[PDB]
C-alpha cells in the first residue's frame, strides 16, 4: 500500500464547506515532498512543522479534510482568524498541527453559466468550536419575532450559494482546499513516512 494522498487531492467530488468530508488515513507511507515542490499548489502553508523537515517525521494519525471555498477567503482558514466562513463553518484549532493546501480549480469544478452546487453558511446562532460541522437547516431566529419554522421576516435560511462563473474576478474564483491535521505522540503510529 501507498497512501491515497493523491486520490483525495484530485478527487472527482469535493463537498460544500458547510458539510465537509473527513477521511482517516491509516497504516501507510506518504511522500509529502512531491506535493511540496509541485507548482500545482497555490498555497501549501504548514503550521506546527516546516514542510522541508516533514520528510522524515513519523506520525500517529493524519486526517484528510475537504471543502471548496473561493480565493478571497483562503486566508480565513488558519488558527485564530475571525470571519464568517471561518467562524460559522470550519475553524482550525489554535494549536492545529498540519498544512492547509489550496489550488485554483476553475478549470474542473466551475462550469460556464455558473456552478451553484457549492453552499456556505452565513447566519448562525453561535460560533462553532474547533472541528465542528453543522448540517442543520433550522431557520435562524435572528429577529426578536418568533421564527416558528417558516422563512421570511427574521427567518433566514442559513445556506447561500456562491456565484461561481468562469469569468468572475480573480478573488471570487473557485479554490479546492484540503486540510491535513497531524498528531505526534509516543505510540504505534499509523503513518511513519518513508523510513
Amino acid at each position, epitope marked *: 500500500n501507498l497512501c491515497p494522498f493523491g486520490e483525495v487531492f484530485n478527487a472527482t467530488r469535493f463537498a460544500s464547506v458547510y458539510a465537509w468530508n473527513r477521511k482517516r488515513i491509516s497504516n501507510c507511507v506518504a511522500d509529502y515532498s512531491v506535493l511540496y515542490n509541485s507548482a500545482s499548489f497555490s498555497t501549501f502553508k504548514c503550521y506546527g512543522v516546516s514542510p522541508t523537515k516533514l520528510n522524515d517525521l513519523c506520525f500517529t494519525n493524519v486526517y484528510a479534510d475537504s471543502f471548496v471555498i473561493r480565493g478571497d477567503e483562503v486566508r480565513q482558514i488558519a488558527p485564530g482568524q475571525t470571519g464568517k466562513i471561518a467562524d460559522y463553518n470550519y475553524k482550525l484549532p489554535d494549536d492545529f498541527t498540519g498544512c492547509v493546501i489550496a489550488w485554483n480549480s476553475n478549470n474542473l469544478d466551475s462550469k460556464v*453559466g*455558473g*456552478n*451553484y*452546487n457549492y*453552499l456556505y453558511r*452565513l*447566519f448562525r446562532k453561535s460560533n462553532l468550536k474547533p472541528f465542528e460541522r453543522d448540517i442543520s*437547516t433550522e*431557520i435562524y431566529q435572528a429577529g426578536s419575532t418568533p421564527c416558528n419554522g*417558516v*422563512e*421570511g*421576516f427574521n*427567518c*433566514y*435560511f442559513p*445556506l*447561500q*450559494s*456562491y*456565484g461561481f*462563473q468562469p469569468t468572475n474576478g480573480v478573488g471570487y474564483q473557485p479554490y479546492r482546499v484540503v486540510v491535513l491535521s497531524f498528531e505526534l505522540l509516543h505510540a504505534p503510529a499509523t503513518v511513519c513516512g518513508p523510513k
Partner: nanobody
Amino acid sequence: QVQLVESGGGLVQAGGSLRLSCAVSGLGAHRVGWFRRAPGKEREFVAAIGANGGNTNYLDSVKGRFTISRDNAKNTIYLQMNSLKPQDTAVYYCAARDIETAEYTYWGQGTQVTVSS
C-alpha cells in the same frame, strides 16, 4: 439589477392545477421565493428554492401538494399548485435575496390566481 416578471395567473376550477412559471433576469446566484397575499392577510412564505438545490422549506398549509423546479437555463422558476383548496386564493409574487437583511431585496409585481368552487 434583477427584475422578475410573473406569468401564469388566472382563475381555475376547484381542484385544478395552474402552472405558475415566472421569467427571471439575472438569476443563478440569488435564491428565489414564492409569497402570497390572502384577501385580508399579510404575506406568509409559500416556497423558495436555492439555485441548483433541493433545499425546500414549505408552510405546513401548503405542505405535500406544492413543489418547485429550477431550469437554470431559461431563467425561470416553476410552481405546480396541485389540488388547490378553495380558500388558498392569493396573489403570488416572485422574490430574490442578496445578503438577506430585513427581508428579500427584490419584489416582482406578480400575478393573480383564483380558484372557483
